[PDB]
């Protein structure tokens, strides 16, 4: 199950947003435009599969297909592309606002029944499963007055109908943020605009669930668990192929050539070998593939190993989050509810032979019960399950000389304890993004609209400790009781 998320944004046209908010600051129109650049960038950098359409109401002209009065669409339900961003961004500020108004409409009345009408009819046209659906609003009206109470009541009925349908309403204050001046009676028909503005960048999410793994703890019992890859790098957008000016990719006829015939290597004519001493030891890719067969894809459990005996010096591939499940074998999660309840003998690690893929050797792994740290705000921290650390082999070692050469004086430990105690970090995990990847993103948006570069910054990986030293006190230099400086 994947689904989708349909998002539509509506703006009135009554000069209540074409106005400058009685300030040199951004207009409600302009702040909505910056919000929509933020939304479009966020959608592009995240899964862009979601469709976004542009529709405006309260307008002198009509280009909605239904052609009801005071409704003017611009964009169909499409993934936000570069051209969409340019065509919406060409209409902002005073000059963009006025040209947009003369090509769209400078402002007129609202017909709520008509707009709910057209939204239901349009959302009918979706041809795919819809995981979520939401409509965000940004309008200054406290409550419907211009429309008669008949239109307000029928809009209330349709609003209840759509709320039961699944779609929900969102709004923010416009006349004055904070307090309560908006939705006094929209309280019945039912900062934060900054979050709708540009706040979060380089987003991505996954709704998948890795395959059912079969615990081969013994020949008699094989059980079903759900593995889950919970950590991996986010990658570089692919250099998909193109052309100088026609802007068109290339295929490939990549095949190794043979001096004998004008043709290429035949799959027989290509033949594997290796120089061992005086031998071109002769094999094929088939033989090398056949060599690596050890046993079936799965975990061939050697057995439990008391986790009370454990070490931190060894390190390997980042861990894998296994989870209890009952997919194709019964009683699975019945016994999976066990082994997470005791930390005296059920915390015991599981030294296991684990083959992840067909035709793969067994790889040593160990189990850690990761108790659902269900955060107090319900945010199940360290979700309920298993942290799996892959165990070393006898080639994870390059020998090191002994460095136990000194155990220095207590004066040095005291001074550097004083030094380091003045700095402690709450360990915010999200505190540093990828500056390299974000800089590549910035190169992309530079090539997007017109910029030589839109943003020239680091993701805060640069050392602020040039100001921490005085914050900690320059005493770090006077706590050098060292007679000779190391860096000379």
């Amino acid at each position: 199950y994947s689904g989708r998320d349909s998002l539509i944004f509506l703006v009135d046209a009554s000069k209540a947003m074409f106005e400058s908010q009685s300030e040199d600051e951004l207009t409600p129109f302009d702040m909505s435009i910056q919000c929509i650049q933020s939304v479009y960038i966020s959608k592009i950098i995240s899964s862009d599969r979601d469709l976004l359409a542009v529709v405006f109401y309260g307008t002198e002209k009509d280009k909605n297909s239904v052609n009801f009065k005071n409704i003017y669409v611009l964009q169909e339900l499409d993934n936000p592309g570069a051209k969409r961003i340019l065509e919406l961004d060409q209409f902002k500020g005073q000059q963009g606002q006025k040209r947009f108004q003369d090509m769209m409409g400078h402002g007129s009345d609202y017909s709520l029944s008509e707009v709910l009408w057209v939204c239901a009819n349009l959302f009918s046209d979706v041809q795919f499963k819809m995981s979520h659906k939401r409509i965000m609003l940004f309008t200054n009206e406290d409550n419907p007055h211009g429309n008669d109470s008949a239109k307000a009541s029928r809009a209330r009925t349709k609003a209840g109908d759509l709320r039961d349908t699944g779609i929900f309403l969102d709004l923010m204050h416009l006349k004055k943020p904070g307090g309560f001046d908006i939705s006094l009676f929209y309280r019945d028909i039912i900062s934060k605009l900054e979050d709708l503005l540009r706040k979060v960048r380089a987003k991505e999410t996954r709704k998948r669930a890795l395959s059912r793994l079969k615990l081969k703890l013994n020949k008699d019992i094989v059980i079903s668990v759900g593995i889950y890859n919970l950590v991996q790098k986010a990658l570089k957008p692919p250099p998909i192929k193109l052309y100088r000016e026609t802007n068109e990719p290339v295929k490939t006829k990549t095949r190794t050539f043979n001096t004998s015939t004008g043709g290429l290597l035949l799959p027989s004519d290509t033949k594997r070998s290796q120089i061992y001493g005086s031998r071109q030891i002769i094999l094929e890719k088939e033989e090398t593939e056949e060599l690596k067969r050890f046993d079936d894809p799965g975990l061939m459990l050697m057995g439990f190993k008391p986790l009370v005996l454990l070490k931190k010096h060894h390190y390997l591939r980042p861990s894998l989050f296994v989870y209890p499940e009952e997919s194709l074998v019964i009683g699975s999660s019945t016994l999976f509810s066990a082994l997470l309840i005791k930390c005296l003998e059920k915390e015991v690690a599981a030294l296991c032979r684990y083959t992840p893929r067909r035709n793969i050797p067994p790889y040593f792994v160990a189990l850690v019960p990761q108790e659902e740290e269900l955060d107090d705000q319900k945010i199940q921290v360290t979700p309920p399950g298993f942290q799996l650390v892959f165990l070393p082999f006898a080639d994870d070692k390059r020998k090191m000389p002994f460095t136990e050469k000194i155990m220095a004086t207590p004066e040095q430990v005291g001074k550097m304890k004083a030094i380091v105690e003045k700095l402690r970090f709450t360990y915010r995990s999200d505190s540093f993004e990828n500056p390299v990847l974000q800089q590549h993103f910035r190169n992309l948006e530079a090539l997007a609209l017109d910029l030589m570069e839109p943003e020239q910054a680091v993701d805060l990986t640069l050392p602020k400790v040039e100001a921490m030293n005085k914050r900690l006190g320059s005493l770090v230099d006077e706590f050098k009781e060292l007679v000779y400086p190391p860096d000379y």
Binding site: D5, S46, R424, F425
Partner: peptide, 23 residues
């Protein structure tokens, strides 16, 4: 339930970066 990302409900509303703190 609250605490879910507005763009992708079911995944968490992650607070933005805050850098390193000095205590």
């Amino acid at each position: 339930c609250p605490g879910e990302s507005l763009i992708n409900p079911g995944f968490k509303s992650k607070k933005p970066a805050g850098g390193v703190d000095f205590d």
